[PDB]
Amino acid sequence: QLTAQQRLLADQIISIFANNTPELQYGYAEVLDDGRGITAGRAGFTSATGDMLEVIQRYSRLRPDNILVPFLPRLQQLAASEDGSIEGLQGLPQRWADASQNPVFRQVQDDVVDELYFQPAMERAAELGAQMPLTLLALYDAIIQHGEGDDGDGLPAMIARTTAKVNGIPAEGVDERRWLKTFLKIRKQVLRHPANLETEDEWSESTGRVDSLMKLLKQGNTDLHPPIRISTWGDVFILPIR
Template identity: 30%
Template sequence: MLSELQKETAKAIVNIFETGSARGDYARVTLLTGDSGHLTYGRAQTTLGSGNLHLLIKAYCATPGAAYARTLKPYLPQLADIDLRLDTDWSFRNVLKEAGGDPVMRDVQDDFFDRVYWTPALASAKRTGLGEALSAAVVYDSVVHGSWIAMRDRTTAKAGAASSAGERRWIGVYLDTRRDWLASHSNALLRKTVYRMDAFKALAASGNWSLDLPMMVRGVRIDPDALCLRPPVNASAIEVATRNLRLTDPKMSGNDVRALEEALSKEGYAINRDGIFDEGLETALKSFQRDFGLVDDGIAGPATRLMLGI
């Protein structure tokens, strides 16, 4: 079990990767040419392309006292549809920046990033056989950055399960595997993010598996007075946009819906596996979300898919 200090240190490391600050930048709006995540926002730079920006703004608009809820609500349908025209919608981008100064938005982001990234990442790390604080930080970073499951499976194919290979050796192989993947990626922006793996490799080499403070990460000292000295490259490693599955009219259908049905069936939920997102599938999905501590909104977003392993 990680301590609260270890948890906050792990999050601070990823904040540095994403925004250059250990505390994170709640108002940061970024769009890098060639970034498959498209428009990114907030403390952990959640992306339009992943569908998570929709879920974040949806949660904010539903929170009492949200100062910019009325302005942001009209954008929810476009966010849900991953409408890439929002990349260059300056009115939308400006209101996001302004909303970043709202204390309600900061609280919503803290809760959202814990719920959508940290908690599923910790659960996935545990299922993989990883328990050390540095390992949790590595998994959390990959969940935020993208492609954790693909790199996990590639590492297991090379090194075997963490339980047999040994956790520290497995993480070492993982860091090398992910670094090689980033360094040779067709997206030039991702090739510039190998520093994330280099930072973790340095912590591992120093023996700081417990994430003891103080520490230096990319020129930033992590302690109560953390100071950013240089900006990061924060391109998303999301390969393609994956739609958030939900009840719509007409109903969603396809292989991704079928994969969701199969995953829920494996978890013991009785559903009709026909590849159509209907009311019965929504009911089963909400039950799964409640059972696993997720928001039971009936939307199969990135956090729910991660918990299901799809």
């Protein structure tokens, strides 16, 4: 689906979207007051949503005695109810940062990203018949921020509403640029007006990333060819960085 240069490009763009830097933030760990508890890692794994749990569980099967093991009971409870409480995760941010110095922990983050976000987003693209690299990037960025749940803010509902609006999918002959433009506008509307009010401030301030994908679409860079200029947060980045 994506070239090696296109995937590194996608990762550096989404990294800029989320953290204003093309360097993947494996060691990032923060409370954002968005209802999700602690948000951590290169894809923003989260205490409330179960993806932070999967990372630590998989890592603990590779390395039973790690500094993150004591949080497994609590994370288990938090994931089971989608709870945003950060008790008692005291010390978890620092331990996540330290664990991220181990390439094997970073590798687990890569595997989870691939399993939860990249491969499902590419499977969605294939079902849609989507073939422009820009559409793949837009689906991949959206799956990371919105998730693949069944809520009206999730990627699957956004795709469904895009297809309803334009009367079909690209594999059915709807021009893919039209489908993509509709998807980006629907995505910006969801970020501005989410059904989950706890993420409203967080998501509302993140709409420049949809603007950046729209800018690439309007400039005809649907194939993600270099150089790519991203300046979502004011700072200008030319990608790929070498």
